[PDB]
Amino acid sequence: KDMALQHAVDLLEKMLADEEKKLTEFNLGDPLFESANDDPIKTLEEIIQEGDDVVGAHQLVVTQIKLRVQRNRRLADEIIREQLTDIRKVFSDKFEKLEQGIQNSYLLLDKLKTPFQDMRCLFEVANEQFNDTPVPPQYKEKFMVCLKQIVQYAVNSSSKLEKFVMLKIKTKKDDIKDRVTYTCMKYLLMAMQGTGGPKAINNEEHAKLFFKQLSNYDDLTDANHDGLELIKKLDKEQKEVAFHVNNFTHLVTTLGMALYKEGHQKNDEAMLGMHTPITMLSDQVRVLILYLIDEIVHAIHTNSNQSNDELIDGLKPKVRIVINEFHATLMMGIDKMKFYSLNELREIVNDKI
Amino acid sequence: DMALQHAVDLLEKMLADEEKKLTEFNLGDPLFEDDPIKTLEEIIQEGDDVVGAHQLVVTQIKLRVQRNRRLADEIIREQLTDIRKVFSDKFEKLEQGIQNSYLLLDKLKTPFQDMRCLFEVANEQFNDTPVPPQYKEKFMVCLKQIVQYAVNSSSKLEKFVMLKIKTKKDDIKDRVTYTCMKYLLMAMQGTGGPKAINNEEHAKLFFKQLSNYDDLTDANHDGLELIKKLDKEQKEVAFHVNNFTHLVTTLGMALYKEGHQKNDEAMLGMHTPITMLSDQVRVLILYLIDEIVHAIHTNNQSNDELIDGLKPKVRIVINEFHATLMMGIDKMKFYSLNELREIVNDKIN
């Protein structure tokens, strides 16, 4: 589909669905039937007030433990299920925010190409340098005529510089989308890896052992005593549940937070990454105009015999060479910011010729 | 000993080297001496003397080009300190981040030193396990012992856990120190300025063609244009300072956010393993309780017989934890008491 992070969103769905399925499965040791006993849970007070005799107390204590083990396991199961619900909530919200932010980064990145559209900046920089270049008056018109034509030739020959900018921009767009997607998937795995709460619950095991040794109690006042103490503990906070709730909440929150940042992070990686190439090419454009201007005035001075056409013509290969040189340099993607001097351009041109 | 010590070194190294190549901003004392640079206003009042004004014009151009060069360097000189201030601050903050994390990883392993936690869980589960008072003694005797065995039989498990926290401490210093350098370069690889200067190129052309001006007033006029532009340049130094400040700040934040994000990812990587290991310890204990009670409540055996019987089951379980822990988090799990039985049964045969 058309979401930048569509793969992340798909994987979130699949994992939750699979996990939600594993919750209802039957695993070894599970009873054939879970107990859903109707009768209401009575408070410790009520049990104390109703247990006149040691045998009536026992009846009351056993059943009230069983009702409570039932209640506690249900709430524990609910909490296991809410882990998945919480993962859906936190990661859906983070993906939506991340997606809205990737879309903005796309725009931002595309704004970087406008000066280079049809390499229109050559015209604008030529306009400026033409106004600021001093030229003895008797040379101005020829300077003008020849500069116009060779700048226009330069525009027509610099298609690869514009196509480079567009390639780089597209690369950063795809970088952002791939990197954020990978991070999204990574955090999602780490989240699903933390699910599953506790399985064994202390007080439930204690009840299981209690009910095992019910026959081995010589004195029913003793059996009642342990039973009542087990009731108190079954109404207290389940420590292992508390431990795992706080741990899982720390895990998902932190994953959540580490991800909210992520899009602004890859956004900035992209904009920072465009800094050197755009800056180098902007400088190259300027330096090209300056080199063309010096060549032209030097030719005008030193070779008044040849026509405008023959002057312009001798410059065309020099134009092609510099543009080629600029392009190879930018393609190298060094990220070491390199600028050219005119003297550097002349040596490169004087070599190829 | 600072964990990010190499980052800091490389910071002072690079700044220093870059600073060497800069030219001094203030001119020394002239052999023959007052400010040599004269205002636009002053140069204008010279203009009745065309030859006089011409000579003053070419001189003031050449002085302004050298002035503007010195400014260019004064720009970088103000930059390298912005790099220093930003990146010192972030290196310090990141370093504090690492030292904190060092303490948190130490915290994580403390329960497992000498596997002390096995005693603590045993205490709590003991106190809470219901048992007839005429068997309470048999329960206590058999539990204290077999838990002590479990502690003694877990030394290879323990040493592995410590090693994994040790390895993770080393991995944090290395990842964050990478992030620090990668971003130091960008602040460096992206400092300086262009080689070809517009006004300098214009000036060079002017002088190239000065002899072809038939009429000095044309030359004088062009020269004054050049001087105005050279002065506009000198007045744009702040703009390039600010722009590079914005740039370094952004590099600094992305530096901080990445070092931090890397730090937190390594800690979270330990979190769930540690959460499962602590649960596995608790389930082991509950499993030992259950065994003992089953073997006491039903089946004419002694404590030694019972306890002897439990030792192979213990080591099987601890080995199971150890083995899954080595395979990694994908092979690690929370256990039911009956999955321990399952495992213990499966291995014996």
Author numbering:
A (entry chain A): 40 to 392
B (entry chain B): 41 to 73, 77 to 342, 344 to 393
Provide passages from the article that reported this PDB entry.
Human cytomegalovirus (HCMV), a ubiquitous beta-herpesvirus causing serious disease in immunocompromised individuals, encodes an abundant immediate-early protein termed IE1 that modulates innate immune mechanisms as well as other cellular processes. In addition to its effects on the innate immune system, IE1 is required to overcome the PML-NB-mediated intrinsic immunity that targets HCMV immediately upon infection. We present the first crystal structure for the evolutionary conserved core domain (IE1CORE) of primate cytomegalovirus IE1, which exhibits a novel, unusual fold. We show that this IE1CORE domain binds with high affinity to PML via the coiled-coil domain.
Crystallization trials with full-length hIE1 remained unsuccessful and, in case of the IE1CORE variants, yielded suitable crystals only for rhIE1CORE after chemical methylation of surface exposed lysine residues. The structure of rhIE1CORE was solved using experimental phases and refined to 2.3 Å resolution (Rwork = 19.73%, Rfree = 24.96%). The main chain of the model was traced between amino acids 41 and 393. RhIE1CORE adopts an elongated, femur-like shape with dimensions of 130×25×25 Å3. The structure can be divided into three distinct regions, namely an N-terminal head region (rhIE1: residues 62–118, 236–283; hIE1 residues 46–103, 221–267) and a C-terminal head region (rhIE1 residues 151–207, 315–393; hIE1 residues 136–192, 300–380) interconnected by a stalk region (rhIE1 residues 41–61, 119–150, 208–235, 284–314; hIE1 residues 27–45, 104–135, 193–220, 268–299). The stalk consists of an uncommon right-handed three-helix coiled-coil (α-helices H3, H6 and H9) with the N-terminal helix H1 added to one side of the three-helix bundle. RhIE1CORE forms a dimer with C2 point group symmetry in the crystal, and oligomerization of rhIE1 and hIE1 was confirmed both by gel filtration experiments and co-immunoprecipitation analyses (hIE1). RhIE1CORE dimerizes with both stalk regions juxtaposed in an antiparallel fashion. The main-chain conformation differs in the two monomers (Cα-RMSD for all helical segments  = 2.13 Å). This deviation originates from a pronounced kink that is observed in one of the two monomers and that causes a repositioning of the loop that interconnects helices H8 to H9 with a concomitant displacement of the N-terminal half of helix H9.
